[PDB]
Amino acid sequence: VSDITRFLSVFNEPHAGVIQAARQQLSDEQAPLRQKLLADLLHHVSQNITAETREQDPSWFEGLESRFRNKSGYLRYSCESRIRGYLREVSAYTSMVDEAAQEEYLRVLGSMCQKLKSVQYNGSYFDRGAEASSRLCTPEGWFSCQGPFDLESCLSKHSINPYGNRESRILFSTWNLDHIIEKKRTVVPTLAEAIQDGREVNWEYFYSLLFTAENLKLVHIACHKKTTHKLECDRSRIYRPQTG
Amino acid sequence: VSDITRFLSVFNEPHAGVIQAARQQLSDEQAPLRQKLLADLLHHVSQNITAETREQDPSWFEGLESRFRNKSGYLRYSCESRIRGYLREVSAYTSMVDEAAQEEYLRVLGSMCQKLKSVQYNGSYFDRGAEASSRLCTPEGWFSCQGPFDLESCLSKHSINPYGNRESRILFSTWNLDHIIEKKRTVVPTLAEAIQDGREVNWEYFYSLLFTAENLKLVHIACHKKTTHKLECDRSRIYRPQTG
Numbered sequence: 042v043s044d045i046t047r048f049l050s051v052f053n054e055p056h057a058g059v060i061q062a063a064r065q066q067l068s069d070e071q072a073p074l075r076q077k078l079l080a081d082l083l084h085h086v087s088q089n090i091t092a093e094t095r096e097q098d099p100s101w102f103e104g105l106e107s108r109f110r111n112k113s114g115y116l117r118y119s120c121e122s123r124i125r126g127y128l129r130e131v132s133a134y135t136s137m138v139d140e141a142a143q144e145e146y147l148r149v150l151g152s153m154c155q156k157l158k159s160v161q162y163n164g165s166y167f168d169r170g171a172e173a174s175s176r177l178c179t180p181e182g183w184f185s186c187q188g189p190f191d192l193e194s195c196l197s198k199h200s201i202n203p204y205g206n207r208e209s210r211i212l213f214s215t216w217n218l219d220h221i222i223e224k225k226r227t228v229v230p231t232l233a234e235a236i237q238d239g240r241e242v243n244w245e246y247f248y249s250l251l252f253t254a255e256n257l258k259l260v261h262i263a264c265h266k267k268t269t270h271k272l273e274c275d276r277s278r279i280y281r282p283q284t285g
Numbered sequence: 286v287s288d289i290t291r292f293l294s295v296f297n298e299p300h301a302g303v304i305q306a307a308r309q310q311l312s313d314e315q316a317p318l319r320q321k322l323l324a325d326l327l328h329h330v331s332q333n334i335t336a337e338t339r340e341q342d343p344s345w346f347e348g349l350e351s352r353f354r355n356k357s358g359y360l361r362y363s364c365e366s367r368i369r370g371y372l373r374e375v376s377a378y379t380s381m382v383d384e385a386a387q388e389e390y391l392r393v394l395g396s397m398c399q400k401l402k403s404v405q406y407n408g409s410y411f412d413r414g415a416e417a418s419s420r421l422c423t424p425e426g427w428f429s430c431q432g433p434f435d436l437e438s439c440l441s442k443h444s445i446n447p448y449g450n451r452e453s454r455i456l457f458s459t460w461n462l463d464h465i466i467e468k469k470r471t472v473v474p475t476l477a478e479a480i481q482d483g484r485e486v487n488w489e490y491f492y493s494l495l496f497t498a499e500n501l502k503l504v505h506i507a508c509h510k511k512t513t514h515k516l517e518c519d520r521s522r523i524y525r526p527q528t529g
């Protein structure tokens with residue numbers, strides 16, 4: 042059954058008449074399953090990961106505004122958006138906070154924003170060619186599913202390289218940056234409750250929870266459990282230590 | 286280059302030691318691309334489309350409530366949800382309607398709901414084993430991307446069988462029932478404006494537009510243009526003909 046090696050051998054490296062071959066078998070209608078595999082294979086091969094600029098691989102950029110000249114640049118922007126989205130969701134909550142603590146909330150929410158700008162909304166997480174302690178991918182653009190929140194790794198071994206294909210760039214939209222300790226369900230509200238407590242809040246902790254890879258797992262959609270994460274915040278890290 | 290035929294030949298029909306083979310090459314770490322193709326192949330093969338009950342293929346049902354015993358049944362429910370979702374979105378608009386026409390809107394919105402219940406929210410669209418003039422798939426469960434709204438067919442030839450795999454069932458979540466004439470952008474508001482007109486509204490027309498395959502294209506995420514569909518409603522079908 043060692044057969045396969047010879048198969049993965051030819052179907053991996055493109056630049057051949059294989060691309061112009063698989064396409065023919067596709068045009069020439071076939072069974073649903075065979076058509077699938079064939080469509081997938083063409084996808085797998087019709088790729089150009091190495092290209093970085095719109096000039097050398099404009100296909101990738103189809104549909105993206107013009108400001109986007111570089112791939113890393115777009116993905117960086119994309120990541121910044123999800124995270125900026127989390128910051129918005131956090132402000133929207135100021136209303137469900139006690140009017141008495143509503144001021145401090147905004148004060149705290151302001152600090153988190155400065156720090157976010159200070160780090161450029163962590164857009165660094167999606168762009169290869171960034172410090173290795175910042176990116177979530179290999180310098181080639183390969184991301185690995187980190188498995189569901191309640192597991193150590195991805196049992197299916199999901200991966201994806203949004204950099205070498207237009208469809209690939211779009212599928213990455215389905216990959217989620219999932220909060221281990223749910224942000225809406227638990228972190229934000231705990232944040233509110235902590236600010237009303239009276240003790241000085243260690244907002245940096247909530248920052249970690251809300252916008253950092255410390256509490257974010259990058260998962261493929263099949264590893265995004267939409268069920269409740271039965272986790273809670275760390276009682277001991279919520280408030281700033283009183284220096285006795 | 287006719288090679289491939291021999292390849293798609295072995296990689297399509299499972300039930301062999303091939304499954305227990307590809308898995309080994311996966312465990313035995315490899316290059317990112319080879320690992321990809323390999324992970325995908327395992328996916329492609331680890332399938333059981335023919336199974337219909339939770340009893341004969343419980344793997345598929347992982348994560349679904351217990352009430353769901355049958356596959357078609359779940360997918361039917363799933364479809365009904367998207368469509369019921371469109372009905373909600375339509376009610377939520379009653380507030381942005383003139384108070385004077387706000388009553389009729391609810392009257393009309395009521396009629397559409399009766400008809401929807403009368404047809405079971407068209408959940409029929411997703412379940413194989415339904416009248417051939419109702420399903421969007423083959424009796425085996427195969428759906429074909431109908432390409433973007435502004436095109437006749439899917440150039441990439443996207444297909445998917447949510448019935449033979451858990452991950453497959455979840456990916457179908459990314460496949461969208463896209464309104465050709467945008468519902469929020471154009472149909473709903475036209476509906477509101479038409480009800481304020483004074484002439485008798487042919488609400489059945491808007492029904493078609495809002496909940497039927499007459500105005501819904503089933504597209505893979507890569508064929509869901511989120512750009513504006515520069516279309517408008519048919520001026521001549523909005524109002525009921527005055528019998529002269």
Ligand SMILES: [Mg+2]
Pocket residue numbers: 218219220
């Ligand atoms: Mg989540």
Ligand SMILES: [Mg+2]
Pocket residue numbers: 462463464
């Ligand atoms: Mg749409």
Ligand SMILES: [Pb+2]
Pocket residue numbers: 151154155
């Ligand atoms: Pb701000």
Ligand SMILES: [Pb+2]
Pocket residue numbers: 395398399
């Ligand atoms: Pb109703």
Ligand SMILES: [Zn+2]
Pocket residue numbers: 186187188189195196197198199260261263264
């Ligand atoms: Zn995974």
Ligand SMILES: [Zn+2]
Pocket residue numbers: 430431432433439440441442443504505507508
């Ligand atoms: Zn398509």
